[PDB]
Amino acid sequence: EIRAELENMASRLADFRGSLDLESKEARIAELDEQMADPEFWNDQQKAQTVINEANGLKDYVNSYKKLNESHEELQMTHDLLKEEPDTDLQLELEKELKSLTKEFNEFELQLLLSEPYDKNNAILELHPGAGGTESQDWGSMLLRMYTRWGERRGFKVETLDYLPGDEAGIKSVTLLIKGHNAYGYLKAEKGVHRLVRISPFDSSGRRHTSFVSCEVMPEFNDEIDIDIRTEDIKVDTYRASGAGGPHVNTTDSAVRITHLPTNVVVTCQTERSQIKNRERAMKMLKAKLYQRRIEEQQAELDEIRGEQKEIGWGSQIRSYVFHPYSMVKDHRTNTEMGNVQAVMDGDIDTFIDAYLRSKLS
RNA sequence: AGCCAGGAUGUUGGCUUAGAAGCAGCCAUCAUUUAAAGAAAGCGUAAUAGCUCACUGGUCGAGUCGGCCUGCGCGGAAGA
RNA sequence: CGGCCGCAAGGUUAAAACUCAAAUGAAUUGACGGGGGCCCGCACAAGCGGUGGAGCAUGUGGUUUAAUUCGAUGCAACGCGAAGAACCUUACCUGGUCUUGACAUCCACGGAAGUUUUCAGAGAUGAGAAUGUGCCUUCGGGAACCGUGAGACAGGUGCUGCAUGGCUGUCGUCAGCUCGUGUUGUGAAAUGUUGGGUUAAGUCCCGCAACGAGCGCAACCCUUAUCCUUUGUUGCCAGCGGUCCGGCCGGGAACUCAAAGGAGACUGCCAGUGAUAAACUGGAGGAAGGUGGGGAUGACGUCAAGUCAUCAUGGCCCUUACGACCAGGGCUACACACGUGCUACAAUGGCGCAUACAAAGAGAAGCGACCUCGCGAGAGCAAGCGGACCUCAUAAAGUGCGUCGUAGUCCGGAUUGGAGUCUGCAACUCGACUCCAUGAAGUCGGAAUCGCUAGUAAUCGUGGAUCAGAAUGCCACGGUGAAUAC
RNA sequence: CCGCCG
RNA sequence: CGGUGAUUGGCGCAGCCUGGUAGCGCACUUCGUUCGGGACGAAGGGGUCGGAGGUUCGAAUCCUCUAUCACCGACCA
């Protein structure tokens, strides 16, 4: 009730003892605080202004881990005294002490694991059954079940934007929307195909069926926050339009060209018998491509997201779910494994996500 | 108004920091000597450092310096 | 593509790269056909009663959970393993504990073992405190266990039934499946096994490049239906005597019955049909007539079907833990879906009173008369019985009378409150039964679907296994008892 | 009469 | 720009015009059929009518603007 939280914090701190590699960090701090005593490195500011920032950025972790370790040990000795001298007055305060320590610890994890930009977003996850018939469809439905059982246990909202069933069994496609606070910061660990080795119940011979379901998971934006541009120079021009068959070429100028300093957007409106409505409709066709290029840059960023690490041969294959011969779930980037596959398929991929972020943080 | 001095205390404190010291900040934002001095108003320093300012004494030899109401002017004020 | 020809459609002549390791022909065996012939099976038809609607019981899927252990999961999983989960079982979860260990063998050491009582603890455990200290004798010394230490090991309901054995389902109790020798074909193969009849049957007869054989079919086995011989109890009472009229007692061995041993039924006989055949139809007789009824009996194989969780087992893997011990919980959760059942919706019925007729089985920490007490479940005292003797044990539908008079009603009996009984350390999660009270849905069930050919379906009760307690399931038993098959 | 697929 | 006519289930359309009274087909859900899938049956759910404000006891419906959508005209010099 108290000592189990200490015994689990002692395992959760070695996660960051390995995932930070603290001896390298204190060696870096030691080789900075020996050389920054001489004033020649802080003479010209253009190196020391980044050197003090890097020194503080490593100093943050090499104080925070030792602070969490000392606040672990001073409660460990206190609980050993409570299991040694039975102070029920100290056992009243130790529960609030453990509550405050867990409130600090999971907050610290949320600091250092999630420095990436699109971690606050809602992870639009998407499953494709890879290749084949009704076993790779069933594996897509099993992965759907595991991800919804993780999202609702996490308290997130699974919206299921798109869906497509399988013909006999399984699914053929699904596109979810996982409304959550740190949704993409957790579901970064799901990019890549999943491998399922089992015996197909849709078989008859009992062949071991190995199956591959691809999972592409993006962060969503739904931003749609763009109104005007006017803080730059909207270089406009009024000129006689390119036309015949009227009094425009004889008398007056109606056409409106608009030129922008952002990305050189130039728009012409020339065919409405009055210059003023050409300005108004040229403003409409200003926004009618400013929003379009906004979608182009959103799509161009997200295409880099969906093409970050899609070149490694077998390293794109993570998460082997062995069912039939020996029943183990293994991750092929972090090298961790859980032998109870049913608790994994019921949605306890939390360890496989924390090991992923703890590996990619180092 | 000038000119000459002084313009100092426990004192660098609890933090953002290898250190934030009267002036990148948020609190404490005061007790001493006096004729007076803000754990300081400004420049300046990575910060300290320097430099002035408030304020206070000496020469000086009398009117000064701001705010309101008004009269008349000034700039704003470039075309074939 | 180029040439020639053509009004055109196009014809004729005619490549290459690339690509694959085959494409193709004829024949053989199977399988398949919305090809053909013949034949069959509750297959359809002819009927009867259901399931799907309702409420509950049980199992499964999902969902939930700390865990809802594991397995089967078209037919051929889903009242299945489980012939019975409160603890145990239990394999699962949470917490507390142990490590050569709960269970084995070996080594060394100390003590007989054993019995009683207290403290702490949820208990496992640890601390104790007394009694005891048997038979050997090399009587330092052993058989017996206890306790400790060390390690070979032990342990695993951990994995793989797609490494296996054994056991099982299945097509299917369907009538097939093969072989030896011979002959035929270059060969795969074929023939036998096909054909005419016939049969429940590759059953039999006849023919025939086949001749034979084997596993199957049939019979041999159990049971049931009739009779006879023996024996006559704790079973029976036909004839006599008494009877308190109860086979109750003398008696009897008749009969029912009990069991052992035989007989009987084989198309045997008759007639007709049919190849002078097998057989088929009909009749006599007989208790039974055409394998009399029912069972057991499961061919070569099929499904890499099921089970490594009954056991055994090759190989992996854990080994101060995936092993071991305990307490509590869970296996019984509940937006929902399915399977299999029980109870109903009533008048061919409900209730009240009276009254008749069974079979089969179980029983010694067991079945438990009588009598008393209790409305009752039951309780007390307590016979008899290791059982043709005693007990379970009242069969109920049935019949006679009365009443209800078609209403959600004297139908239904779920759900819930209160009071209890018993089992077991213990009935909260979660037992069964009783009493009082309550009185839900339900008024005959959509598409769809199941079983059954005669003592069958339908309905009615009884008993057993498992089991301290805990069947609406399973396995057996008798009562009444059909409709229909053109 | 209608009877597609694996 | 105005003129003119529409926004009803997840989709395509009704209903509006006449003030009370939202349905059709597909699709979805469950059950059935099937070795399974489709097809086919049998049950069942489905929207508070673009938004806002008035008329009235009452508005999806009658007006009023605001948004969106499509058609028509935007002329002569």
Short mmCIF file of C-alpha atoms (C1' of nucleotides) in Angstrom, two decimals, chain C residues 3-380:
data_model
loop_
_atom_site.label_atom_id
_atom_site.label_comp_id
_atom_site.label_asym_id
_atom_site.label_seq_id
_atom_site.Cartn_x
_atom_site.Cartn_y
_atom_site.Cartn_z
"C1'" G C 3 5.66 -3.99 -98.93
"C1'" C C 4 1.64 -5.56 -102.11
"C1'" C C 5 -3.87 -5.85 -102.54
"C1'" G C 6 -8.68 -3.68 -101.18
"C1'" C C 7 -13.84 1.49 -101.77
"C1'" A C 8 -13.49 0.14 -96.77
"C1'" A C 9 -13.68 -3.63 -93.32
"C1'" G C 10 -9.37 -5.78 -93.72
"C1'" G C 11 -6.40 -9.73 -96.35
"C1'" U C 12 -1.44 -11.67 -97.38
"C1'" U C 13 3.96 -11.77 -96.24
"C1'" A C 14 6.00 -11.49 -91.40
"C1'" A C 15 9.53 -10.16 -86.68
"C1'" A C 16 11.96 -8.55 -82.24
"C1'" A C 17 12.73 -7.25 -77.11
"C1'" C C 18 10.57 -8.90 -72.77
"C1'" U C 19 8.64 -13.05 -70.15
"C1'" C C 20 8.00 -18.56 -67.99
"C1'" A C 21 10.01 -23.58 -67.12
"C1'" A C 22 6.92 -25.19 -68.86
"C1'" A C 23 2.85 -25.35 -72.62
"C1'" U C 24 0.64 -29.73 -75.11
"C1'" G C 25 -1.43 -34.81 -76.82
"C1'" A C 26 -3.57 -39.52 -75.56
"C1'" A C 27 -4.78 -42.67 -71.81
"C1'" U C 28 -5.45 -44.40 -66.11
"C1'" U C 29 -7.38 -43.81 -60.98
"C1'" G C 30 -10.48 -40.93 -58.09
"C1'" A C 31 -13.61 -36.70 -57.19
"C1'" C C 32 -17.30 -33.59 -59.19
"C1'" G C 33 -21.88 -32.30 -62.67
"C1'" G C 34 -27.91 -27.45 -62.13
"C1'" G C 35 -25.38 -35.48 -67.10
"C1'" G C 36 -27.98 -40.61 -67.37
"C1'" G C 37 -29.81 -45.40 -65.02
"C1'" C C 38 -31.06 -48.24 -60.49
"C1'" C C 39 -31.71 -48.21 -55.09
"C1'" C C 40 -32.01 -46.42 -50.07
"C1'" G C 41 -32.33 -43.32 -45.17
"C1'" C C 42 -38.05 -39.40 -40.54
"C1'" A C 43 -34.87 -37.17 -46.92
"C1'" C C 44 -39.49 -35.38 -48.83
"C1'" A C 45 -44.57 -36.72 -48.39
"C1'" A C 46 -48.67 -38.23 -44.55
"C1'" G C 47 -49.24 -36.80 -39.50
"C1'" C C 48 -48.15 -35.66 -34.02
"C1'" G C 49 -45.54 -32.68 -30.56
"C1'" G C 50 -42.07 -28.91 -30.34
"C1'" U C 51 -37.88 -24.62 -30.87
"C1'" G C 52 -37.90 -19.31 -32.38
"C1'" G C 53 -42.21 -14.97 -28.52
"C1'" A C 54 -42.47 -15.04 -22.24
"C1'" G C 55 -40.19 -16.13 -17.32
"C1'" C C 56 -36.42 -18.93 -15.14
"C1'" A C 57 -32.09 -22.92 -15.19
"C1'" U C 58 -27.49 -24.13 -17.59
"C1'" G C 59 -23.47 -23.46 -21.30
"C1'" U C 60 -21.08 -20.25 -24.86
"C1'" G C 61 -19.74 -15.33 -27.40
"C1'" G C 62 -18.86 -10.49 -25.99
"C1'" U C 63 -18.33 -6.91 -22.25
"C1'" U C 64 -16.62 -5.98 -17.35
"C1'" U C 65 -12.95 -7.14 -13.85
"C1'" A C 66 -7.71 -7.62 -9.49
"C1'" A C 67 -9.11 -12.33 -11.38
"C1'" U C 68 -13.70 -13.68 -14.01
"C1'" U C 69 -8.47 -20.48 -14.54
"C1'" C C 70 -7.85 -23.77 -18.81
"C1'" G C 71 -9.74 -26.47 -22.99
"C1'" A C 72 -13.91 -27.85 -27.15
"C1'" U C 73 -15.79 -23.47 -30.53
"C1'" G C 74 -19.60 -25.70 -38.63
"C1'" C C 75 -22.34 -30.69 -39.17
"C1'" A C 76 -19.06 -33.85 -35.65
"C1'" A C 77 -18.19 -26.98 -29.90
"C1'" C C 78 -22.19 -24.35 -26.84
"C1'" G C 79 -27.02 -28.86 -19.73
"C1'" C C 80 -19.52 -30.13 -23.63
"C1'" G C 81 -14.31 -31.82 -20.09
"C1'" A C 82 -17.36 -30.81 -15.02
"C1'" A C 83 -20.85 -38.10 -12.58
"C1'" G C 84 -22.39 -31.88 -9.16
"C1'" A C 85 -17.09 -24.21 -7.90
"C1'" A C 86 -19.39 -21.54 -0.42
"C1'" C C 87 -13.88 -23.15 2.08
"C1'" C C 88 -11.50 -27.54 -0.36
"C1'" U C 89 -11.93 -28.50 -5.30
"C1'" U C 90 -8.64 -24.47 -8.02
"C1'" A C 91 -5.40 -24.68 -12.06
"C1'" C C 92 -7.02 -17.77 -11.46
"C1'" C C 93 -6.33 -12.70 -8.69
"C1'" U C 94 -4.61 -9.62 -4.18
"C1'" G C 95 -1.83 -9.86 0.18
"C1'" G C 96 1.30 -12.55 3.61
"C1'" U C 97 5.27 -16.59 3.73
"C1'" C C 98 9.33 -21.12 2.03
"C1'" U C 99 13.58 -22.66 -0.47
"C1'" U C 100 16.94 -29.06 -1.72
"C1'" G C 101 11.69 -27.30 -0.97
"C1'" A C 102 4.46 -29.68 -0.41
"C1'" C C 103 6.24 -34.67 -2.98
"C1'" A C 104 11.07 -38.67 -4.15
"C1'" U C 105 16.11 -41.40 -3.30
"C1'" C C 106 21.06 -40.83 -1.46
"C1'" C C 107 25.05 -38.41 2.53
"C1'" A C 108 26.12 -36.60 7.51
"C1'" C C 109 24.44 -35.29 12.40
"C1'" G C 110 20.74 -35.04 17.03
"C1'" G C 111 16.46 -37.38 18.98
"C1'" A C 112 12.21 -42.95 19.58
"C1'" A C 113 8.01 -41.91 17.36
"C1'" G C 114 3.89 -40.29 19.68
"C1'" U C 115 0.37 -37.38 23.24
"C1'" U C 116 -1.46 -32.74 25.84
"C1'" U C 117 -1.70 -27.18 26.56
"C1'" U C 118 -0.72 -21.83 26.02
"C1'" C C 119 0.96 -16.98 23.27
"C1'" A C 120 1.39 -14.11 18.60
"C1'" G C 121 -0.79 -14.31 13.79
"C1'" A C 122 -6.12 -14.09 8.77
"C1'" G C 123 -3.58 -18.49 8.69
"C1'" A C 124 0.70 -20.38 6.72
"C1'" U C 125 3.99 -20.01 10.54
"C1'" G C 126 7.26 -18.93 14.82
"C1'" A C 127 7.76 -19.08 20.19
"C1'" G C 128 6.96 -22.48 23.47
"C1'" A C 129 5.45 -25.71 28.07
"C1'" A C 130 4.65 -30.61 29.87
"C1'" U C 131 3.82 -36.18 29.06
"C1'" G C 132 6.12 -40.00 26.45
"C1'" U C 133 11.21 -42.24 25.20
"C1'" G C 134 8.45 -49.00 22.09
"C1'" C C 135 11.29 -53.86 19.29
"C1'" C C 136 16.48 -55.03 18.12
"C1'" U C 137 21.52 -55.10 19.85
"C1'" U C 138 27.70 -55.03 16.82
"C1'" C C 139 23.45 -52.52 22.82
"C1'" G C 140 29.26 -45.69 19.76
"C1'" G C 141 25.69 -49.24 17.27
"C1'" G C 142 19.46 -50.37 13.60
"C1'" A C 143 14.93 -51.14 11.58
"C1'" A C 144 10.74 -45.93 12.20
"C1'" C C 145 9.83 -41.29 11.65
"C1'" C C 146 11.01 -36.53 13.33
"C1'" G C 147 14.39 -32.07 12.85
"C1'" U C 148 18.79 -29.61 10.43
"C1'" G C 149 22.68 -28.75 6.61
"C1'" A C 150 25.04 -29.48 1.45
"C1'" G C 151 24.04 -31.10 -3.62
"C1'" A C 152 22.91 -34.24 -7.35
"C1'" C C 153 17.88 -33.15 -7.89
"C1'" A C 154 12.69 -32.69 -6.94
"C1'" G C 155 8.64 -29.78 -8.83
"C1'" G C 156 5.58 -27.28 -13.44
"C1'" U C 157 -2.63 -28.00 -14.68
"C1'" G C 158 4.30 -24.08 -18.27
"C1'" C C 159 4.84 -24.52 -24.37
"C1'" U C 160 4.30 -27.46 -28.79
"C1'" G C 161 -2.12 -32.69 -29.98
"C1'" C C 162 1.47 -29.51 -36.37
"C1'" A C 163 7.13 -34.14 -32.59
"C1'" U C 164 3.91 -38.61 -30.29
"C1'" G C 165 1.43 -43.05 -27.55
"C1'" G C 166 -3.19 -44.26 -25.56
"C1'" C C 167 -8.30 -42.84 -25.81
"C1'" U C 168 -12.38 -40.41 -28.64
"C1'" G C 169 -15.67 -37.93 -32.39
"C1'" U C 170 -16.80 -38.37 -37.51
"C1'" C C 171 -18.65 -39.90 -42.61
"C1'" G C 172 -21.45 -44.46 -40.80
"C1'" U C 173 -23.67 -49.94 -38.88
"C1'" C C 174 -22.70 -46.76 -44.90
"C1'" A C 175 -21.56 -51.71 -47.45
"C1'" G C 176 -17.92 -51.40 -48.78
"C1'" C C 177 -12.09 -51.95 -48.74
"C1'" U C 178 -8.22 -54.93 -50.40
"C1'" C C 179 -4.58 -58.79 -51.39
"C1'" G C 180 -2.01 -63.57 -53.56
"C1'" U C 181 -1.56 -66.06 -58.17
"C1'" G C 182 -3.05 -65.80 -63.22
"C1'" U C 183 -4.25 -62.93 -67.65
"C1'" U C 184 -4.41 -58.07 -70.27
"C1'" G C 185 -1.78 -53.01 -71.22
"C1'" U C 186 4.74 -49.95 -73.20
"C1'" G C 187 2.89 -48.07 -68.59
"C1'" A C 188 -0.24 -45.61 -64.89
"C1'" A C 189 -3.55 -49.42 -64.24
"C1'" A C 190 -7.32 -53.17 -65.31
"C1'" U C 191 -9.74 -58.11 -64.21
"C1'" G C 192 -11.43 -60.48 -59.83
"C1'" U C 193 -15.23 -56.38 -57.43
"C1'" U C 194 -18.34 -56.57 -64.01
"C1'" G C 195 -23.17 -58.46 -66.15
"C1'" G C 196 -28.89 -60.99 -65.36
"C1'" G C 197 -31.74 -61.52 -61.23
"C1'" U C 198 -31.99 -60.90 -55.92
"C1'" U C 199 -31.02 -59.06 -50.87
"C1'" A C 200 -31.15 -55.18 -45.21
"C1'" A C 201 -26.13 -56.42 -47.04
"C1'" G C 202 -19.73 -57.26 -52.37
"C1'" U C 203 -26.62 -61.37 -49.36
"C1'" C C 204 -27.06 -65.58 -52.48
"C1'" C C 205 -27.62 -68.00 -57.48
"C1'" C C 206 -26.23 -68.02 -62.64
"C1'" G C 207 -22.83 -66.26 -66.31
"C1'" C C 208 -17.89 -64.62 -66.99
"C1'" A C 209 -9.88 -64.48 -67.67
"C1'" A C 210 -10.31 -65.28 -63.90
"C1'" C C 211 -9.17 -68.73 -59.65
"C1'" G C 212 -9.00 -67.98 -54.43
"C1'" A C 213 -8.39 -65.38 -49.89
"C1'" G C 214 -8.82 -61.48 -45.98
"C1'" C C 215 -11.09 -57.38 -43.21
"C1'" G C 216 -16.23 -56.09 -43.36
"C1'" C C 217 -22.29 -58.03 -43.85
"C1'" A C 218 -24.72 -62.26 -41.49
"C1'" A C 219 -24.15 -65.52 -37.22
"C1'" C C 220 -21.60 -66.58 -32.29
"C1'" C C 221 -22.88 -62.40 -26.99
"C1'" C C 222 -26.57 -59.73 -23.60
"C1'" U C 223 -31.70 -58.66 -23.04
"C1'" U C 224 -36.92 -59.28 -24.16
"C1'" A C 225 -41.36 -62.34 -25.88
"C1'" U C 226 -43.53 -68.90 -24.97
"C1'" C C 227 -42.95 -73.58 -22.72
"C1'" C C 228 -40.43 -77.49 -19.95
"C1'" U C 229 -36.89 -79.68 -15.80
"C1'" U C 230 -34.66 -78.50 -11.02
"C1'" U C 231 -34.72 -75.71 -6.18
"C1'" G C 232 -38.42 -73.27 -2.90
"C1'" U C 233 -36.18 -68.50 0.93
"C1'" U C 234 -36.43 -63.63 3.43
"C1'" G C 235 -40.62 -64.85 -2.40
"C1'" C C 236 -45.98 -67.54 -3.76
"C1'" C C 237 -51.01 -69.26 -1.79
"C1'" A C 238 -54.22 -73.32 -5.60
"C1'" G C 239 -56.36 -77.12 -2.37
"C1'" C C 240 -57.63 -78.21 3.60
"C1'" G C 241 -57.75 -76.37 9.37
"C1'" G C 242 -57.85 -72.16 12.68
"C1'" U C 243 -57.84 -67.09 12.05
"C1'" C C 244 -57.23 -61.40 16.26
"C1'" C C 245 -59.24 -62.43 8.87
"C1'" G C 246 -53.08 -59.63 7.94
"C1'" G C 247 -50.51 -65.54 3.77
"C1'" C C 248 -51.81 -64.10 9.80
"C1'" C C 249 -50.42 -69.07 11.44
"C1'" G C 250 -50.32 -74.46 10.58
"C1'" G C 251 -49.32 -76.30 6.05
"C1'" G C 252 -48.69 -77.05 0.23
"C1'" A C 253 -44.60 -76.82 -4.13
"C1'" A C 254 -49.76 -75.77 -7.42
"C1'" C C 255 -49.31 -70.83 -9.60
"C1'" U C 256 -46.94 -65.54 -9.94
"C1'" C C 257 -41.93 -65.11 -9.13
"C1'" A C 258 -36.44 -65.88 -8.30
"C1'" A C 259 -32.55 -68.03 -10.92
"C1'" A C 260 -29.62 -72.11 -13.39
"C1'" G C 261 -30.27 -75.90 -17.64
"C1'" G C 262 -32.79 -76.99 -21.96
"C1'" A C 263 -36.64 -76.52 -26.05
"C1'" G C 264 -38.26 -73.07 -29.75
"C1'" A C 265 -37.92 -69.99 -35.57
"C1'" C C 266 -34.45 -72.41 -39.69
"C1'" U C 267 -38.19 -69.28 -45.52
"C1'" G C 268 -38.91 -75.33 -41.71
"C1'" C C 269 -44.00 -76.62 -44.41
"C1'" C C 270 -47.84 -75.46 -48.35
"C1'" A C 271 -49.30 -72.93 -52.89
"C1'" G C 272 -48.02 -69.54 -56.68
"C1'" U C 273 -44.37 -66.47 -59.33
"C1'" G C 274 -39.14 -66.70 -60.96
"C1'" A C 275 -33.66 -68.85 -65.65
"C1'" U C 276 -35.15 -77.02 -64.13
"C1'" A C 277 -31.77 -71.31 -59.72
"C1'" A C 278 -31.21 -67.58 -55.99
"C1'" A C 279 -35.13 -65.49 -54.15
"C1'" C C 280 -40.23 -63.08 -53.90
"C1'" U C 281 -45.47 -63.20 -52.62
"C1'" G C 282 -49.38 -65.50 -49.80
"C1'" G C 283 -51.26 -69.13 -46.38
"C1'" A C 284 -51.12 -73.02 -42.28
"C1'" G C 285 -48.90 -73.78 -37.63
"C1'" G C 286 -46.90 -71.18 -33.56
"C1'" A C 287 -45.69 -67.24 -27.89
"C1'" A C 288 -42.99 -65.44 -31.82
"C1'" G C 289 -42.37 -65.38 -39.46
"C1'" G C 290 -39.11 -64.07 -42.39
"C1'" U C 291 -31.73 -60.49 -39.72
"C1'" G C 292 -39.18 -61.41 -34.09
"C1'" G C 293 -38.02 -56.35 -30.87
"C1'" G C 294 -33.91 -53.58 -28.43
"C1'" G C 295 -28.70 -53.46 -27.42
"C1'" A C 296 -23.56 -54.55 -27.82
"C1'" U C 297 -20.75 -54.95 -32.09
"C1'" G C 298 -17.69 -49.31 -35.88
"C1'" A C 299 -14.18 -52.30 -42.10
"C1'" C C 300 -9.62 -49.79 -45.25
"C1'" G C 301 -9.57 -45.03 -44.33
"C1'" U C 302 -11.14 -39.35 -43.96
"C1'" C C 303 -10.52 -34.77 -41.01
"C1'" A C 304 -1.85 -32.92 -40.05
"C1'" A C 305 -10.45 -33.20 -36.22
"C1'" G C 306 -10.15 -33.42 -30.16
"C1'" U C 307 -7.08 -34.17 -25.82
"C1'" C C 308 0.65 -33.03 -24.07
"C1'" A C 309 -5.29 -30.42 -18.34
"C1'" U C 310 -6.60 -37.98 -16.85
"C1'" C C 311 -2.13 -40.47 -17.80
"C1'" A C 312 2.43 -41.42 -20.45
"C1'" U C 313 5.85 -38.95 -23.58
"C1'" G C 314 10.42 -36.52 -27.53
"C1'" G C 315 12.10 -31.63 -27.42
"C1'" C C 316 12.05 -26.41 -25.20
"C1'" C C 317 11.59 -23.30 -20.86
"C1'" C C 318 11.40 -21.78 -15.18
"C1'" U C 319 14.58 -23.44 -10.86
"C1'" U C 320 15.56 -18.67 -3.49
"C1'" A C 321 10.51 -19.48 -8.99
"C1'" C C 322 6.29 -20.38 -14.39
"C1'" G C 323 7.89 -24.49 -8.02
"C1'" A C 324 5.53 -24.56 -2.53
"C1'" C C 325 2.09 -22.98 1.82
"C1'" C C 326 -2.02 -20.03 3.75
"C1'" A C 327 -6.20 -16.32 4.24
"C1'" G C 328 -9.68 -13.67 1.52
"C1'" G C 329 -11.82 -13.10 -3.30
"C1'" G C 330 -12.98 -15.09 -8.32
"C1'" C C 331 -14.60 -19.25 -11.48
"C1'" U C 332 -21.80 -17.08 -10.02
"C1'" A C 333 -19.96 -10.11 -12.81
"C1'" C C 334 -24.07 -7.99 -16.95
"C1'" A C 335 -25.65 -2.25 -21.99
"C1'" C C 336 -26.16 -7.29 -25.18
"C1'" A C 337 -26.27 -11.95 -28.75
"C1'" C C 338 -26.71 -17.39 -29.37
"C1'" G C 339 -27.47 -22.83 -27.92
"C1'" U C 340 -29.83 -26.54 -24.98
"C1'" G C 341 -33.74 -27.21 -21.27
"C1'" C C 342 -37.67 -26.43 -17.29
"C1'" U C 343 -42.25 -23.80 -16.28
"C1'" A C 344 -46.42 -21.63 -18.35
"C1'" C C 345 -50.26 -19.10 -21.10
"C1'" A C 346 -55.19 -22.91 -18.74
"C1'" A C 347 -61.76 -25.69 -18.37
"C1'" U C 348 -58.74 -32.71 -22.22
"C1'" G C 349 -57.85 -27.50 -16.64
"C1'" G C 350 -56.97 -25.34 -11.26
"C1'" C C 351 -58.01 -26.51 -6.14
"C1'" G C 352 -60.24 -29.51 -2.11
"C1'" C C 353 -61.61 -34.51 -0.12
"C1'" A C 354 -61.65 -39.71 -0.93
"C1'" U C 355 -59.52 -43.87 -3.59
"C1'" A C 356 -56.73 -47.61 -7.31
"C1'" C C 357 -52.48 -49.62 -10.17
"C1'" A C 358 -45.89 -49.96 -10.97
"C1'" A C 359 -40.97 -51.04 -12.43
"C1'" A C 360 -36.06 -50.36 -11.45
"C1'" G C 361 -32.36 -49.10 -7.95
"C1'" A C 362 -29.52 -47.63 -3.59
"C1'" G C 363 -28.05 -48.14 1.67
"C1'" A C 364 -23.00 -48.91 7.54
"C1'" A C 365 -19.03 -42.19 9.73
"C1'" G C 366 -25.10 -45.28 5.43
"C1'" C C 367 -30.88 -46.07 4.57
"C1'" G C 368 -33.09 -44.67 8.69
"C1'" A C 369 -39.48 -47.44 10.82
"C1'" C C 370 -42.78 -46.52 14.73
"C1'" C C 371 -44.20 -42.70 18.36
"C1'" U C 372 -43.91 -37.52 19.96
"C1'" C C 373 -43.22 -32.29 18.78
"C1'" G C 374 -43.68 -28.54 14.69
"C1'" C C 375 -48.45 -25.35 9.68
"C1'" G C 376 -43.95 -26.89 7.23
"C1'" A C 377 -38.86 -27.61 5.84
"C1'" G C 378 -37.60 -30.58 9.92
"C1'" A C 379 -36.41 -32.04 15.42
"C1'" G C 380 -36.20 -35.66 19.48
#
